[PDB]
Design a protein around this ligand. Structure first.
Ligand code: ATP
Ligand code: MG
Length: 500
């Protein structure tokens, strides 16, 4: 069955089941179908021949999902733009893409863009005006036609197709041990593809998306009360977000008695975090997945068990889905032998058809191999019997003491030290070269009476792992590590405040 049909199926079998919920606003599979049908019909009547991508502005309102499906039912790809995206980048996206329409949940603040803006009331009138109407079944985006276009920080628009999303979703449902009618957490803003990991697997299995917004996360007591009521079963988020929840004593099986599946992607998953989770949720399975946005969310996955925890101090990123394959490459097109590190490369139906209008950018990253699209991740790693390991981004490989060290690796051994609960390394550069490393750490419990004593203890244990030239010169301590709007470590913010 087509992707949409797998979804529309629940509108029929389970019409009154909650499809999406954000705070008090809820929508059933029936309304979702009904309203997205009406929106699609409208889009077609307004743009009979055009199929340009459509922007969908908002945060966590149910209209975001209604609008996405409406856009694709009419043959248009959608571009999720979260309220957190700076206005300048939003305008860029407006002209960058060929978008001629922007649908908005709430009020659209960003200074007028060069597109037609349908918002708030306008959108409501459409659902009302076109209620009952249905789109031409044959207008639904298909095959290699764009489904959604999510942008890179900057600003490149990765084009994900129907076939791409179908390949990811089919895999996700299969190997993530998903069932039907489960409640899926949604922590990631829609302009971050990690959200796709829960949105579609949930919709095709008739689950319930339980959204957590930005303000709620800023007010911990609300977040946790919300989690206590969610009855979430499938947790999809970045490692950093789980860890912050973990900093909360009551966050365990007690708060989420039905938790059964954790899905992590986007950054390094600390062995300890997975450890605490396995402990706090003995009934749950932990999955670590890896992948860039250019390859449709994630391509590798592995069940992180105590066993894996016991034999892998540094957790692996998983096995590649069978319809794709991985390649590790060194200096030249030299395909490194299993065990050796090189840049990770992905090939298969998951790979993006390339950046939106920029054969210049699509040039270096994307290529063809035996007829299949391929993408260079910019990530360093290696394979061992089909199991992929992540070392770090090629860019976070710095040059100090005429020695080459990797940010991610140092952070790992640092995290391993006593008294260190959270840690990030900020490479400080004097002039145009890297002068020294600054360690920002969230201290665990301790009895030191003076800061210098704590820093000496950590540096001493750290020197038991890493060479002396890898040990950061300066340490700084704070109550928490900042997360960007996507839930990832805010390295930019950190470097900004080390400078200041
Ligand atoms: N399981 C994982 N373990 C470690 N790192 C991961 C994992 N999954 C993803 N990553 C990292 O996250 C990156 C993918 O993130 P994303 O697609 O959001 O773009 P980004 O690199 O974070 O930001 P940008 O917009 O600049 O590209 C990968 O290239 C990889 O370095
Ligand atoms: Mg990238």
């Amino acid at each position: 069955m087509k992707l949409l049909e797998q979804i529309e199926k629940w509108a029929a079998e389970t019409p009154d089941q909650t499809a999406f919920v954000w705070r008090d606003a809820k929508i059933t599979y029936k309304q979702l179908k009904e309203d997205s049908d009406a929106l699609a019909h409208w889009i077609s009547s307004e743009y009979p021949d055009d199929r340009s991508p459509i922007m969908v502005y908002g945060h966590m309102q149910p209209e975001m999902i209604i609008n996405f499906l409406g856009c694709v039912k009419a043959g248009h790809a959608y571009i999720p733009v979260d309220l957190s995206i700076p206005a300048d980048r939003v305008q860029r996206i407006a002209e960058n893409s060929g978008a001629k329409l922007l649908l908005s949940a709430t009020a659209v603040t960003v200074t007028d863009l060069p597109v037609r803006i349908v918002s708030e009331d306008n959108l409501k009138d459409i659902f009302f005006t076109h209620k009952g109407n249905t789109p031409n079944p044959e207008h639904a985006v298909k095959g290699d036609e764009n489904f959604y276009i999510i942008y890179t920080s900057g600003p490149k628009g990765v084009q994900i197709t129907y076939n791409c999303l179908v390949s990811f979703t089919k895999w996700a449902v299969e190997d993530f041990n998903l069932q039907t009618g489960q409640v899926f957490l949604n922590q990631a803003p829609f302009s971050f593809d990690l959200s796709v990991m829960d949105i579609y697997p949930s919709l095709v299995t008739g689950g319930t998306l339980w959204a957590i917004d930005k303000d709620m996360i800023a007010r911990p007591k609300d977040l946790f009360a919300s989690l206590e009521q969610s009855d979430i079963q499938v947790w999809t988020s970045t490692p950093s977000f789980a860890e912050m929840c973990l900093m909360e004593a009551s966050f365990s099986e007690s708060m989420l008695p039905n938790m059964k599946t954790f899905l992590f992607c986007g950054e390094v998953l600390p062995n300890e975090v997975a450890r605490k989770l396995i402990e706090r949720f003995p009934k749950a399975t932990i999955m670590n997945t890896y992948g860039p946005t250019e390859a449709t969310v994630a391509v590798t996955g592995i069940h992180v068990t105590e066993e894996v925890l016991d034999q892998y101090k540094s957790l692996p990123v998983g096995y590649c889905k069978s319809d794709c394959r991985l390649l590790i490459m060194k200096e030249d097109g030299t395909i490194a032998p299993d065990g050796e590190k090189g840049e990770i490369v992905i090939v298969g139906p998951s790979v993006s058809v390339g950046y939106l209008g920029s054969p210049e950018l699509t040039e270096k990253a994307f290529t063809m191999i035996d007829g299949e699209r391929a993408y260079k991740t910019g990530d360093a790693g290696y394979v061992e019997n089909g199991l992929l390991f992540y070392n770090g981004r090629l860019d976070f490989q710095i040059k100090l003491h005429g020695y080459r060290m990797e940010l991610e690796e140092i952070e790992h051994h640092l995290r391993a030290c006593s008294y260190v609960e959270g840690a990030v390394i900020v490479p400080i550069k004097k002039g145009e070269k890297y002068d020294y490393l600054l360690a920002v750490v969230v201290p665990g419990e301790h009895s030191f009476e003076k800061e210098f004593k704590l820093t000496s203890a950590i540096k001493k244990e750290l020197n038991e792992r890493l060479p002396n030239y890898m040990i950061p010169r300066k340490f700084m301590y704070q109550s928490s590590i900042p997360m960007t709007p996507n839930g990832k470590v805010d390295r930019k913010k950190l470097l900004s405040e080390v400078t200041a």
